[PDB]
Design a protein around this ligand. Structure first.
Ligand SMILES: [Mg+2]
Lengths: 50, 203, 121, 153, 149, 119
RNA sequence: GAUGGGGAAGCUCCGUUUCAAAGGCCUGAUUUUAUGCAGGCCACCAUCGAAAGGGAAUCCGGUUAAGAUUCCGGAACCUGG
RNA sequence: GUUCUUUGUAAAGUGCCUUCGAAGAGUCGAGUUGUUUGGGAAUGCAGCUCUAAGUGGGUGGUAAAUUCCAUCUAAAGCUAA
RNA sequence: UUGACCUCAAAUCAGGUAGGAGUACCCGCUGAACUUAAGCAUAUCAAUAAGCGGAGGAAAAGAAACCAACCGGGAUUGCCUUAGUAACGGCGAGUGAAGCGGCAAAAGCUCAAAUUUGAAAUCUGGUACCUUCGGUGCCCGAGUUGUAAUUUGGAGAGGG
């Protein structure tokens, strides 16, 4: 909603900062098993449930 | 020594002097709260025989509890089972009114330790007890090696674990052939004689 | 003896002398320093093109501000850190969770002159 | 308040009921003139305070240092005896010469047997007003009993 | 259910008996720790013989009264006849039982004789000084065996 | 690089406060450069030096308060020992070693003797 | 929905002004002075519960890629002091 | 083990004679009710009613009366493995 | 009028303490039914699961108001055994201990009820100092409606 509470806006800000792909230099580290952001979230595909 | 006069006078409860005194005191105790602090023991001989000493850090509360059976708390008396468990009214609580009295007193003063309790009065509705409590933080009980055992943390809520006199009475802790079910703890003995013991070289 | 006259059927609790605390020891024994001082309420400026358009046109500085700071603290700390009198402060909370402050200066000072004194232009 | 109401209605009830004669063997207390003169007699025989006890012990220690008397430099005391078990033992041993019983002991069963015991053992007793009066006689707050067991000539 | 000519069995396994199954896998390790406890106790009481002296005493029932065995402690009458107080006997290592009585003169004489031999065999150290070290034995029961009359 | 705690410890509190405010001025001046430069690893040394100065100031003030409360009961709770709640509530060695005089007389009269058994 | 209380072995239940000693309000007086003592007044008796109920006070013009009764220019109003 | 304080005109133990020897109450116990136990004319526990004694009381696995005997000392409390 | 006592309050009074977590094991309360009986109601499952209260490194129990009936044993706990026994049970299904014996470990104890009465000899707190898990001095207070010394039934006390 437009009139939202600060708790909801804080959680929205955190999820907006989490919404990003993998940093590309992570794959160059030794013994790296991380291939991609497996915790990626999109607004069309799944809801936050907050 | 006045204390043996107080004892052997206290055994004449239906003498006219004691029933008049009881009749006045039971009204006086209904007029107060359910749990309230007594300033001094009503029976100082009984208190000091149970272990009270008139020094700083010994506390007496007075308490009344409701008499009678324990009604089974089920909605409209429906038990939903076999007819052997359909009883609601004539069921009895396994602990004593003295035990639940001192347990409520301990919950009221959780910083104290319950030592003992004694009957003082009764009527049709209530039974009246006086509970002796000792403060395990007071320095007169931190010192005085006769009583500093109560400051050990294994004695937290003795009345809740059934370690007072009426607690051991209700748990059945006594020597003898009449107490084979309850001698070292009923559930402990049940586990001990329902355990299956298998050795490495099977006997 | 004679009893005290009472013109009211109500009995009230008598007024008792209430003393103040005289502790034997201090509570925390080292008073904390300033939780929110001038260097903590002003983190850094915002130097996007939208913000930089404001610094000559509106005479408005744009700062990123800690989320615990209000307009009094922002105004006092801008006055203390940059020795500039301010006209007004308007704040918002950005969608990334930070706080942005538009500080409009007085007409005596020039925000374009102050920004490259700070070191960004 | 309820404490005022309880402390008034309790003494109302204690005379509304027919009390059995072991109580109201009390409440015929001593009259005020004879009570005043018996407390005037008892005030001459007062137990020693802490400071005069302390200087008595310093004098005794100095005397056993100089002359080595077996703690017998000080004379024989003459004091009122107090304390309930103490005076009950005195009455049972027939050593008490006059016993005063306070009329307001708040378990009354602490002192109801005392006049009958005094009558059986032949010790003269008096129910007197004021455990606070007995306490200020023996330098306490409350004493609940007092006894003269041996008096000067 | 009931079947061919077999005896009637009574196997009490109708409760949740698999919740209470104690298999003594720790027999060997428990024995090893038990010997460790005995050795560290002996090192802690390094002159003293690890167990108190027990009296000889007659076993109770008609099945076992033909045999004699070890008791809990000596009678106060026995230690007074031996010529030492109960507190002193407890400090020098003699078990004292305040609640058994002497009704049998042979058992009384045997226990008094046993106390006499114990007092002849022990060395009591002075409480303050030299401590003349004396190479402990570990079993007063083995040095004073119980003999059937 | 940064500052060193052992050479910070020789200064007075006003010099420490002034060094702290110049460190904060330097941190602000590095933060306004971080946005223009791609990388600026020099910020971490200034941050750790600020932490070091604050640690030295706090330890100086705490030691002064300890010497103010030296040798008396009722010192503040953050200055007295932490160990655990149960060990703080446990009996002290004196109270645990308190014994009645009757038991003390019995222990003096009949202590556990040392004895050996061969001859 | 706490408290005072009363039930309940207990998790907790009842009740919301009740069988409570339930508090704060202005003038000041004093100018070791702090705020007690001079006073006098009053008896509701926690608190939560509406972005559509009640309610102090802002409009026009312009401006951005994306904000505006919120920014800019002008012109007002209310509350507290 | 080495050393300092002397605790202490203190405390404790032991033999014989004599006078005594205080020992826990709405508890023990009994009836009845419910539950429980291997416990059976009633194993323990609890509710209600009645309610002691002092050469007394409890137990001695068949209820009761009478006469004995044996064995402990309740209704208060601490304690390692 | 003044000063006590008793009882009951109020303080952001001086100093403390309780709550919650964990919960395999421990101490209690409360408490089923599925199942078995070839149906089923007593019974069984089970004095169990679920629920609630309370501890510790163990807990609990523990120094006999015991076991026995013998030439008697001697706190508690645990193991082997007693024993699938005595006994309970629509005497059906099923249930079901304890004494003795061997062993592991072993350890004993203390209050109340007594006049110190030629001296409340006892104790918390505050303050000052010190060698500070505390000590000494001083001052209030607690306490005679009884805090210390003396005794705990195995005894023991008062005299000689
Ligand atoms: Mg009920």
């Amino acid at each position: 909603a437009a009139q939202k509470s600060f708790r909801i806006k804080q959680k929205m800000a955190k999820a907006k900062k989490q919404n990003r792909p993998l940093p590309q230099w992570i794959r160059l580290r030794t013994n790296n098993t991380i291939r991609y952001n497996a915790k990626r979230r999109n607004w069309r595909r799944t809801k936050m449930n907050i | 020594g006045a204390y043996k006069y107080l004892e052997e006078l206290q055994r004449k409860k239906q003498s006219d002097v004691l029933r008049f005194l009881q009749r006045v005191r039971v009204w006086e105790y209904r007029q107060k709260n359910v749990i309230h602090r007594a300033a001094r023991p009503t029976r100082p001989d009984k208190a000091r025989r149970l272990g009270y000493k008139a020094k700083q850090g010994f506390v007496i509360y007075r308490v009344r509890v409701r008499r009678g059976n324990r009604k089974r708390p089920v909605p409209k008396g429906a038990t939903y089972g076999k007819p052997t468990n359909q009883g609601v009214n004539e069921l009895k609580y396994q602990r004593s009114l003295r035990a639940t009295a001192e347990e409520r007193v301990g919950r009221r003063a959780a910083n104290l330790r319950v030592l003992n309790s004694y009957w003082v009065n009764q009527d049709s509705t209530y039974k009246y007890f006086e509970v002796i409590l000792v403060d395990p933080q007071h320095k007169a009980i931190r010192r005085d090696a006769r009583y500093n055992w109560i400051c050990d943390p294994v004695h937290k809520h003795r009345e809740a674990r059934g370690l007072t006199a009426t607690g051991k009475k209700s748990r059945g802790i006594n020597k003898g052939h009449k107490f084979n079910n309850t001698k070292a703890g009923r559930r402990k003995t049940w586990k001990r004689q329902n355990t299956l013991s298998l050795w490495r070289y099977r006997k | 003896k004679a009893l005290k006259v009472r013109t009211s059927a109500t009995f009230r609790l008598p007024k008792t002398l209430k003393l103040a605390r005289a502790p034997k020891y201090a509570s925390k024994a080292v008073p904390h320093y300033n939780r929110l001082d001038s260097y903590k309420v002003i983190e850094q400026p915002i130097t996007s093109e939208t913000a930089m358009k404001k610094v000559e046109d509106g005479n408005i500085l744009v700062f990123q501000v800690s989320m615990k700071a209000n307009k009094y603290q922002i105004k006092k700390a801008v006055k203390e850190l940059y020795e500039v009198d301010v006209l007004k402060v308007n704040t918002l909370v950005r969608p990334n969770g930070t706080k942005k402050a538009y500080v409009r200066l007085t007409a005596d000072y020039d925000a374009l002159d102050i920004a490259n004194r700070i070191g960004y232009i | 308040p309820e404490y005022v109401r309880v402390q008034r209605q309790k003494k109302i009830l204690s005379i509304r009921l027919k009390v059995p004669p072991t109580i109201a063997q009390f409440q015929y207390t001593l009259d005020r003139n004879t009570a005043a003169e018996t407390f005037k007699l008892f005030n001459k025989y007062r137990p020693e305070t802490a400071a005069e006890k302390k200087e008595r012990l310093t004098k005794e220690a100095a005397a056993v240092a100089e002359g080595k008397s077996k703690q017998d430099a000080s004379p024989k005391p003459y004091a009122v005896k107090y304390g309930l078990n103490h005076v009950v033992a005195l009455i049972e041993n027939k050593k008490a010469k006059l016993v005063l019983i306070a009329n307001d002991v708040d378990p009354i069963e602490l002192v109801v047997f005392l006049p009958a015991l005094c009558k059986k053992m032949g010790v003269p007793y008096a129910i007197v007003k004021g455990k606070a009066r007995l306490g200020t006689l023996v330098n306490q707050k409350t004493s609940a009993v007092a006894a003269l067991t041996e008096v000067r000539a | 259910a009931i079947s061919k000519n077999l005896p009637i069995l009574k196997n009490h396994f109708r409760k949740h008996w698999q919740e209470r199954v104690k298999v003594h896998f720790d027999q060997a390790g428990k024995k090893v720790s038990r010997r460790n406890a005995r050795a560290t106790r002996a090192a802690k009481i390094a002159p003293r013989p690890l167990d108190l002296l027990r009296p000889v005493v007659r076993a109770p029932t008609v099945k076992y009264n033909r045999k004699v065995r070890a008791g809990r402690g000596f009678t106060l009458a026995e230690v007074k006849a031996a010529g030492l107080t109960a507190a002193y006997a407890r400090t020098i290592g003699i078990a004292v039982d305040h609640r058994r009585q002497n009704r049998n003169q042979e058992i009384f004489d045997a226990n008094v004789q046993r106390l006499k031999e114990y007092q002849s065999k022990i060395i009591v150290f002075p409480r303050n000084g030299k401590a003349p070290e004396a190479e402990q034995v570990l079993s007063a029961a083995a040095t004073f065996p119980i003999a059937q009359p | 690089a940064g500052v060193k705690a052992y050479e910070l410890r020789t200064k007075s509190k006003e010099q420490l406060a002034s060094q702290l405010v110049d460190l904060k001025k330097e941190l602000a001046e590095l933060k306004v450069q971080k946005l223009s430069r791609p990388s600026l690893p020099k910020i971490k040394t200034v941050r750790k030096s600020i932490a070091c100065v604050l640690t030295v100031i706090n330890e100086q003030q705490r030691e002064a308060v300890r010497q103010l409360y030296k040798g008396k009961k009722y010192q503040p709770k953050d200055l007295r020992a932490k160990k655990t709640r149960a060990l703080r509530r446990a009996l002290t060695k004196f109270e645990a070693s308190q014994v009645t005089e009757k038991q003390r007389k019995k222990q003096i009269a009949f202590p556990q003797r040392k004895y050996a058994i061969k001859a």
